[PDB]
Design a protein around this ligand. Structure first.
Ligand SMILES: *[C@@H]1O[C@H](CO)[C@@H](O[C@@H]2O[C@H](CO)[C@@H](O)[C@H](O)[C@H]2NC(C)=O)[C@H](O)[C@H]1NC(C)=O
Ligand SMILES: *[C@@H]1O[C@H](CO)[C@@H](O[C@@H]2O[C@H](CO)[C@@H](O)[C@H](O)[C@H]2NC(C)=O)[C@H](O)[C@H]1NC(C)=O
Ligand SMILES: *[C@@H]1O[C@H](CO)[C@@H](O[C@@H]2O[C@H](CO)[C@@H](O)[C@H](O)[C@H]2NC(C)=O)[C@H](O)[C@H]1NC(C)=O
Ligand SMILES: *[C@@H]1O[C@H](CO)[C@@H](O[C@@H]2O[C@H](CO)[C@@H](O)[C@H](O)[C@H]2NC(C)=O)[C@H](O)[C@H]1NC(C)=O
Ligand SMILES: *[C@@H]1O[C@H](CO)[C@@H](O[C@@H]2O[C@H](CO)[C@@H](O)[C@H](O)[C@H]2NC(C)=O)[C@H](O)[C@H]1NC(C)=O
Ligand SMILES: *[C@@H]1O[C@H](CO)[C@@H](O[C@@H]2O[C@H](CO)[C@@H](O)[C@H](O)[C@H]2NC(C)=O)[C@H](O)[C@H]1NC(C)=O
Ligand SMILES: *[C@@H]1O[C@H](CO)[C@@H](O)[C@H](O)[C@H]1NC(C)=O
Ligand SMILES: *[C@@H]1O[C@H](CO)[C@@H](O)[C@H](O)[C@H]1NC(C)=O
Ligand SMILES: *[C@@H]1O[C@H](CO)[C@@H](O)[C@H](O)[C@H]1NC(C)=O
Ligand SMILES: *[C@@H]1O[C@H](CO)[C@@H](O)[C@H](O)[C@H]1NC(C)=O
Lengths: 236, 366, 49
């Protein structure tokens, strides 16, 4: 039931500053009041992050996704390489009651969109391998980190109440791990899903690179400060 | 002392001979509650099985499967295994499982085997000579066989070639044994490759219907997620024991701890990468690990030429867990450890054989 | 076919180096005790060639 729209979704591809956002707990080890240096994939400090106001985008090593969401318009994500039924594809949706994760060889349309009056953006669903249902993911800031290492899909999430108008606020907030999936795919591209009723959304995208960080753990094991060891000589 | 010094005489002094450590008492192992069992009841308790040339295929992944009950089932006539021993397959596991279920004759049960030939083996289902897995066969004469004739079951009788490993043939093309073509109508040299089974309740052992399910294990590079539960046990406290907490193995004494783990950590380490706290997977509480006591032992002697009695000092060990010198003589507790074989005096003299923390010993007894 | 040669099929544990075992006894492969009588999960440890 998927058709292309008349007008082009010419979302302006603007740029903005990353500041000091995009820090997640690297493992499940508890530390109290200590400085720990770790080397991993991170979003570099004061990086240059893209802002969209639904093009196909690359995946690279990892993805940092941010949404200045109001009233929960964003709905899901699509992952794959060929994006057809000749190769495995991943689908994530967050409707009202639960979140649904599928790993199948779908046949998506040229412009997927959820529609409201379940999923109809795909013509066919065959050779399904992995299914999953869980609790719902979602003036709010929603931050997600997506990684895919040795057949394991890692998803980290964070929600924040903000009152600033346009850009990412200054501050520090670590990201807790959310989901690990033992499915082996070689995803290289992804997409955004919107419940576009027939009758214009802002989100930020950044990439991850390997580097070393210095993290501070307080008494309760919460990461409260980080230092990027490749920004400037003082940081080194 | 004599063995360490490699001599038959010892001069006055204090010597460090050997070490001391508490031995583990028992062992424990903990694991989560174990859920999401693999669906196997609906396979072996299903109402109907498909035809032999249309064997039902089932894919099993991402669950826990207990094959011990299947092996211990007394209602199975034949339970054979090729790749591994049936007993120990509950521990090792692969990434996915394939189940092929069908119904064959009583005399055709041994057709389904590596290095075997037959009508079923070459027309309906062929196993590779390198097949790994198991086969479960059981008579179903009272259920599958029909008094009016269970002709719903059909078997392939004709094909130009054999069957590839794990290949299903459901072709209904008229087989042409001879060189005379036929326009879809069976004739002298044309026949139907599929023939109905003539199972009856009274036909004898060998022709009775037999339900057979073949399990095959595959180890694709994706992580393995299907194999038996890992049995846990109870736990003890205030005892130097060795533990296997969810794959984390180590020796120590476990006590109650007041640390506050944040809800997604599992274990903690303080500094220099040494684990100090764990979370039990079942009760979900924070425990504390301490290395059970150890330390060196030293001997104080006045000299072999002078006397023959000695005293023993355990370094940095509390005077509670000493263990022939378990009781011996009066036992003294000092800031440097525990001492056995000497008596405490209230006087004070020049230091002869230094011990530590401002005290030393001499011979008079010691 | 020569059947004068047989090899062990079941054994409780692993053989020690330079050890010899010749006893021919039924194997309690399953939980059910064979009690010296062949049955389910009870097989002769010797297999011919
Ligand atoms: C949100 O999505 C969930 C997941 O698909 C829906 O719940 C399932 O809906 C299907 C289709 O009716 C049923 O077959 C399942 O039994 C449902 N599962 C559960 C756990 O409820 C849910 O209905 C959707 N809700 C809305 C408002 O769209
Ligand atoms: C349909 O699903 C099956 C099973 O997942 C796929 O079969 C696998 O194909 C890969 C490709 O080489 C093999 O490496 C595996 O050994 C196959 N079996 C498995 C994974 O159990 C099949 O490729 C899928 N079909 C399509 C068109 O994607
Ligand atoms: C770290 O943990 C401690 C102890 O759990 C927290 O101290 C408590 O904080 C709450 C509210 O912040 C107070 O109601 C309690 O009275 C505090 N405990 C005591 C003993 O006074 C502390 O807030 C946590 N966070 C930080 C940053 O230290
Ligand atoms: C098929 O169903 C039967 C009937 O319940 C199962 O047999 C039972 O197995 C349990 C487990 O040991 C016993 O406690 C019962 O006494 C058995 N009852 C009967 C009537 O046999 C059997 O286990 C099921 N098979 C599978 C594969 O799930
Ligand atoms: C694992 O299973 C055990 C067995 O039921 C659970 O232990 C019970 O948990 C309930 C939950 O409040 C208590 O009311 C019972 O007293 C517990 N029984 C005991 C300890 O013998 C345990 O909670 C489960 N752990 C999970 C689900 O993480
Ligand atoms: C060796 O262990 C014992 C056992 O705890 C210690 O005895 C404690 O001594 C303190 C101070 O006198 C008391 O408050 C505790 O109640 C004692 N423990 C018990 C269980 O009664 C002893 O102090 C330890 N040795 C040294 C040198 O500290
Ligand atoms: C980000 O990149 C754009 C062009 O891609 C550039 O105009 C802008 O100045 C950059 N912002 C930085 C480097 O902070
Ligand atoms: C993805 O494709 C590459 C080749 O481009 C291949 O090497 C890799 O194995 C594929 N991923 C998986 C999970 O098979
Ligand atoms: C030391 O040994 C000698 C004999 O070897 C003995 O004569 C002497 O008295 C000893 N010295 C003592 C006991 O102080
Ligand atoms: C003298 O020594 C005894 C034991 O040897 C001790 O109990 C006492 O406290 C010491 N001091 C005195 C008696 O003033």
């Amino acid at each position: 039931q998927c058709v292309n729209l008349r007008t082009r979704t010419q979302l302006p591809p603007a740029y903005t500053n990353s500041f000091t956002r995009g820090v997640y707990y690297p493992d499940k080890v508890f530390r109290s009041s200590v400085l720990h240096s770790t080397q991993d994939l991170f979003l570099p400090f004061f990086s240059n992050v893209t802002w969209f106001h639904n093009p196909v985008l690359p995946f690279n090593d990892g993805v940092y996704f941010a949404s200045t969401e109001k009233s929960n318009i964003i709905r899901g994500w699509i992952f794959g390489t060929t994006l057809d039924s000749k190769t495995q594809s991943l689908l994530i949706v967050n409707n009202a009651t639960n979140v649904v994760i599928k790993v199948c060889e779908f046949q998506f349309c040229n412009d997927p969109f959820l529609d409201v009056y379940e999923s109809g953006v795909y013509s066919s669903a065959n050779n399904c391998t992995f299914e999953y249902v869980s609790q719902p993911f979602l003036k709010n800031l929603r931050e997600f980190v997506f990684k895919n290492i040795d057949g394991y899909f890692k998803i980290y999430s964070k929600h924040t109440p903000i009152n600033l108008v346009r850009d990412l606020p200054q501050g520090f907030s670590a990201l807790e791990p959310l989901v690990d999936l033992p499915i082996g795919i070689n995803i290289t591209r992804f997409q955004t899903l919107l419940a576009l009723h027939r009758s214009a959304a802002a989100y930020y995208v950044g990439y991850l690179q390997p580097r070393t960080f210095l993290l501070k753990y307080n008494e309760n094991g919460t990461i409260t400060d980080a230092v990027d060891c490749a920004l400037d000589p003082l940081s080194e | 002392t004599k063995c360490t010094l490699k001599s038959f005489t010892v001069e006055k002094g204090i010597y460090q001979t050997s070490n001391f450590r508490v031995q583990p008492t028992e062992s424990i192992v903990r694991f989560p509650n174990i859920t999401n069992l693999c669906p196997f009841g609906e396979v072996f308790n299903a109402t109907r099985f498909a035809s032999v040339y249309a064997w039902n295929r089932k894919r099993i992944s991402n669950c826990v499967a207990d094959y011990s009950v299947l092996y211990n089932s007394a209602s199975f006539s034949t339970f054979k295994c090729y790749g591994v021993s049936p007993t120990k397959l509950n521990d090792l596991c692969f990434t996915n499982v394939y189940a092929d279920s069908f119904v064959i004759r009583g005399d055709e049960v041994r057709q389904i085997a590596p290095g075997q030939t037959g009508k079923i083996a070459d027309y309906n289902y062929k196993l590779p000579d390198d097949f790994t897995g198991c086969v479960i066969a059981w008579n179903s004469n009272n259920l599958d066989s029909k008094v009016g004739g269970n002709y719903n079951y059909r078997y392939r009788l004709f094909r130009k070639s054999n069957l590839k490993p794990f290949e299903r043939d459901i072709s209904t093309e008229i087989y042409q044994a001879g060189s005379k073509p036929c326009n879809g109508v069976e004739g002298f040299n044309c026949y139907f490759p599929l023939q109905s089974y003539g199972f009856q309740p009274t036909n004898g052992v060998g022709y009775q219907p037999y339900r057979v399910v073949v399990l095959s294990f595959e180890l694709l590079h994706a992580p393995a997620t299907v194999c038996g539960p890992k049995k846990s046990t109870n736990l003890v406290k205030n005892k130097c024991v060795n533990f296997n907490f969810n794959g984390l193995t180590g020796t120590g004494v476990l006590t109650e701890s007041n640390k506050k783990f944040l809800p997604f950590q599992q274990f903690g380490r303080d500094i220099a990468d040494t684990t100090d706290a764990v979370r039990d997977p079942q009760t979900l509480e924070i425990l504390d690990i301490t290395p059970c006591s150890f330390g060196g032992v030293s001997v104080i002697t006045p000299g072999t030429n002078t006397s023959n009695q000695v005293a023993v000092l355990y370094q940095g060990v509390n005077c509670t867990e000493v263990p022939v010198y378990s009781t011996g003589s009066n036992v003294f507790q000092t800031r440097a450890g525990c001492l056995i074989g000497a008596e405490h005096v209230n006087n004070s003299y020049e230091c002869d054989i230094p011990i530590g923390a401002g005290i030393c010993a001499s011979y008079q007894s010691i």
